[PDB]
From a paper:
The tri-longin domain (TLD) RabGEF complexes represent a family of RabGEFs with a unique conserved structural core. In each complex, two subunits that contain three longin domains (LD1 to LD3) each form a heterodimer, which is required for catalytic activity toward the cognate Rab GTPases. We here report the cryo-EM structures of the Mon1-Ccz1 and Inturned-Fuzzy core complexes bound to their cognate GTPases Ypt7 and Rab23 in the nucleotide exchange transition states, revealing a conserved catalytic mechanism with distinct modes of substrate recognition. Thus, TLD RabGEFs rely on both conservation and variability in the switch 1 regions of their substrates to realize catalytic efficiency and specificity.
Mon1-Ccz1 is a dimer in yeast and activates the Rab7 homolog Ypt7. To investigate potential interactions of Mon1NTD and Ypt7HVD with the TLD GEF core complex, we use full-length Mon1 and Ypt7 in the current study. Analysis of purified complexes by cryo-EM revealed a mixture of dimeric CtMon1-Ccz1 and trimeric CtMon1-Ccz1-Ypt7 particles. The experimental map does not reveal unmodeled density that could be interpreted as the Mon1NTD or Ypt7HVD. Consequently, our structures do not provide support for models that suggest an autoinhibitory interaction of the NTD of Mon1 with the longin domains or recognition of the Ypt7HVD by Mon1-Ccz1 at the chosen conditions. The analysis of the electrostatic surface potential of Mon1-Ccz1 revealed a large basic patch on the Mon1LD2 located opposite of the Ypt7 binding site that—together with an amphipathic helix in a disordered region of Ccz1LD2 (17)—mediates binding of Mon1-Ccz1 to model membranes. Here, the titration of CtMon1-Ccz1 on the SLBs yielded an apparent dissociation constant KD of 67 nM. With respect to membrane recruitment, we observe a notable difference between the fungal Mon1-Ccz1 complexes, which strongly bind to charged lipids, and the metazoan Mon1-Czz1-Bulli homologs, which only bind weakly. Also, while the electrostatic interactions of the fungal complexes are primarily mediated by the Mon1 subunit, metazoan complexes depend on Bulli/RMC1 for membrane association in vitro and functionality in animals.
Residue numbers in the entry:
A (entry chain A): 189 to 323, 333 to 457, 486 to 609, 612 to 664
B (entry chain B): 11 to 54, 94 to 155, 181 to 359, 460 to 476, 490 to 501, 527 to 583, 598 to 624, 644 to 670, ...
Write the structure that this text describes.
Amino acid sequence: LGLGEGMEGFERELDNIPDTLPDDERLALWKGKLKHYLILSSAGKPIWSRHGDLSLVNSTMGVVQTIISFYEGARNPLLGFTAGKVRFVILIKGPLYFVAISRLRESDAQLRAQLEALYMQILSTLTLPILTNIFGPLQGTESLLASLADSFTKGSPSTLLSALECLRLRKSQRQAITNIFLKSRCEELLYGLLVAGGKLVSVIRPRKHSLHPSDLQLIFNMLFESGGIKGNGGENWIPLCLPAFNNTGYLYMYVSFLDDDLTALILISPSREAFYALQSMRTRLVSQLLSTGYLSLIRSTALSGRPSITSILPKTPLLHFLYKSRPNVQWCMSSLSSLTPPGATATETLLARRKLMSVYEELHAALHARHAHLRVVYSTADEKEGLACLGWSTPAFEVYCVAPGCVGRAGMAREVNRVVQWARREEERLFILGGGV
Amino acid sequence: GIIPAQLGFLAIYNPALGTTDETLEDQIVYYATASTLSQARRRHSKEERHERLRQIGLAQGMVEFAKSFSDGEPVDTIDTEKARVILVEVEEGWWILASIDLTRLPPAYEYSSREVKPPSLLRADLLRAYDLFLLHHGSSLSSLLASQGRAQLVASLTRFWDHFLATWNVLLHGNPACDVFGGIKLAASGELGIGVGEEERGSGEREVLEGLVERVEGLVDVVVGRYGGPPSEKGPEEEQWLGLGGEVGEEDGAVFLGVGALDRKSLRGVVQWMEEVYVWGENAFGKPRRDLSTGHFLLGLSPKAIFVELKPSYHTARLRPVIYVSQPFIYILLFSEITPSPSTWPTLAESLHAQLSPLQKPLLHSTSYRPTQHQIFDLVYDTETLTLQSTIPNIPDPQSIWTRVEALQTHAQILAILSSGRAIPEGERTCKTARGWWIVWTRVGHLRSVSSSH
């Protein structure tokens, strides 16, 4: 894949600005960051800054607060403003103002989606009446938000597509997993859910209640995309809100590692006295899985990464792809090992992932442009080899792909058709179209 | 009963003009709102000024704020709920702040911008208007200030921009794809053939118009372009062609630019003024009135002058324009300021009518020259020479092969994906549609913009 395109200061972009160096070059380093996430109150006093300290960002957030106060006095809320290569996107959620400052050539829609995900995390930690009453506010949530924003900066396909990934299990094996995971329903579980390394495995559901995709994204961005599930390697009775299910219901989540890549079990209950009961869940689940050897199958399927693009489609020129089912609201992709040379450090793979994700981001901006009904978008970056990319946005699915620059339009649109055929061939395997009883 | 997306306000302000507190009021060198522009449209308080100064002050606040973030780039656009504001630095220290209210759909209103011009296109239109203002006034706004004085600059800006904003339509209209690059819009024939053996492409007319600038004194440049069609041999032969306030057609454009002696940036402005004359005859700036003796001559030499920049291989010149008008052609002849004295103008006009009348029929034939699954509409924009040749049809008025809604949709997609790829001042940004429109944009110094239909 083409190296050294577009931005060039991302190798240290995730590195936090130290506090030892004086405040002048400290603010210079903060402003030099490619991406900024800020949360401020109605009065505009600083609430949360992704990179800088609150005192450092106080002046910047005061200036933007004066701007927003004048616009609110003018009855015209601000939705963002563009200064050349940089773009400011502001989303108005109650007393809170969320601003995302992007130098990575990202559209208004993607920044709004990321700010909405941060707001959903805040709403999940603090219930909506409490969110209105606070106008402390982010106790414990600051690290989760910082890590989730870092995941956004590195390129998060799940937030781009507003969908989730899957483990790619055989339909028979996944059906057996769901059957076992429902045979221990305990007559108490509200939302059952099982994940292997950020990839959803199985879901059991009540008859009337439906597990909304927004709740799925909220849970996944809380646990796996933010990586806040790490460190609490044990019994976790985490409080929850699930605003899609109810914006005032203060639900409860049971999280425990399947260490009996790292499989996690997520169980939602509306009662706080049910943790022990959900404890009687997990063992009755785990042993059953350990009786069937299935948990080993989940561990092995998660241990091996995304399927290789050559293995998915033999003799293909595509280097990567990103398929997404709208009706199943779930996505998948090929491995990123093919993007980088086999001997690669964290920096090289990180840069390659960010670069590929920026290509997908500009393609998604092209397809998902309001007042613009674009079905297929193709682009070719020169990279003085080259790179080519296509995005298909039919009402049935959504495909993104990347190939070397020497393919041509038809020579890789054929590959897009082939990967669509592969995805619809394994729609049962790659996605959880249903759930439980 | 929806409300059209009329522009909210437009402000021309120089921050350096007002430094102290009591001199803040002179920062706004021009300000206009729809209430102010109603009188200008029909022709064609302390709290209000307090709002104006707050608006320009917070525009300056955003540019100061984002100067650090963008590392030397001001806030180009501002997206709000009910106003698509843009702020364009036309020149060093001079800014145009224009807020365009979106469509208010029913007092709870639902806001939308389906047909509102994109901020890149709005910036292009404001830059075009600024270039026209410089064409008719001085070399630059800073020079105009430092020469004339603030009162004269305010008066001239007020007149020109009231007229423009009265005539300005902020919705999608005409051919924005030609207008998003600016540039010199060429006709369907494009340009007259220069070499020998291209008589069908206009070699003889090219030679005659080339030798005209030496045959008559004072004349430096001849700019002619086809706008409309040949005269109709009917009752109303006039047809009011020179006015009509309409839009330039896809086949309407310059057919013969100058020999040289004039910078291509100024040639763009001259061609745009010629388009304004075609659209706003008897109403464009300078008040072009047809000569009572012969209706051919418009804006006679017998004063009025326009400001251009000349080619270095030949500098601001302040040439005097004269607009010879045939029914399909608009010859703009730019004379020197001092050598063709107006006393000889009645004779010289006759000589002009002697040397341009035999260039009606042959040049009409020459301009008729015309240079693929169903239909191919490509837009070739030469960056170096600023020439734009577009086969893409313009948006119809409220037979044409397009309909209004399809034109709006596909045309909004065209310049949107142009803005995505930074086309505006290989890159094969091919884009398909659900309606069968196949855009192929390539970067060659040509901004090729092919667009297949169905």
